[PDB]
Ligand binder design. Structure first.
Ligand SMILES: O=C(O)C(=O)N[C@@H](CSCc1cccc([N+](=O)[O-])c1)C(=O)O
Ligand SMILES: [Fe+3]
Length: 201
């Protein structure tokens, strides 16, 4: 396959998108999007927030999952029903019926925003997949392999696409290329990505 252990489900979230986006807005009304600072001192171009019991954040110049939003000093908003349902349906179709995320990181891309190449290794159990849902403007996703120098492959992720990153692919280096400007009827001028994680012990 494209990436061993990954399951791409194009347009899987297409019908759910309008509701998901309403729920992104609701979460953000409580824990606002913010551009976090990397441990290296750089302000991320991607803006982020979280919902669920745990939320990914930079903290004391490292990263961690925290039950509290350090910007509001309140818990991250509860996981919306629409998020919970979509993630479970996707995980199940992909062969991970027991996947129980307790964190959802919500990434917002304005034109030009990108993610540099990296691995997702902050979770306690790397056998749990990550479920990724793309909404709005299309992005070029790049992913390599288990080594930083593995050859990259590229794939366009479009509105409604869901990828379940399990098995070996769960540990691949990956990133997102600078978002091209455009219009989408539901998000207007941005892309959102939801990544569901099992972050608790
Ligand atoms: O927030 C992040 O760290 C991140 O990368 N977010 C991507 C979606 S998740 C893509 C992903 C997750 C886990 C494994 C692999 N992979 O092996 O390509 C890709 C995004 O904002 O579009
Ligand atoms: Fe990642």
């Amino acid at each position: 396959p494209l990436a061993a252990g990954a399951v791409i489900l194009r347009r899987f979230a297409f019908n759910a998108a309008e509701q998901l986006i309403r729920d992104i807005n609701d979460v953000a009304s409580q824990s606002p999007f913010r551009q976090m600072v990397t441990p290296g001192g750089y302000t991320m171009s991607v803006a982020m927030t979280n919902c669920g019991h745990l939320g990914w954040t930079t903290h004391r110049q490292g990263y961690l999952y925290s039950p509290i939003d350090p910007q509001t000093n309140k818990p991250w908003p509860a996981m919306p029903q629409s998020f919970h349902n979509l993630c479970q349906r996707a995980a199940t179709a992909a062969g991970y019926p027991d996947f129980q995320p307790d964190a959802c990181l919500i990434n917002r891309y304005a034109p030009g925003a990108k993610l540099s190449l990296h691995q997702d290794k902050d979770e306690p159990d790397l056998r749990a997949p990550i479920v990724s849902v793309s909404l709005g403007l299309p992005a070029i996703f790049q992913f390599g392999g288990l080594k930083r120098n593995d050859p990259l492959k590229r794939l366009l992720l479009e509105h409604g696409d869901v990828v379940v990153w399990g098995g070996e692919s769960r540990l691949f280096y990956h990133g997102i290329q600078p978002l091209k400007a455009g219009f989408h009827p539901l998000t207007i001028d941005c892309r959102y990505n939801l990544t569901f994680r099992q972050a608790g012990k």
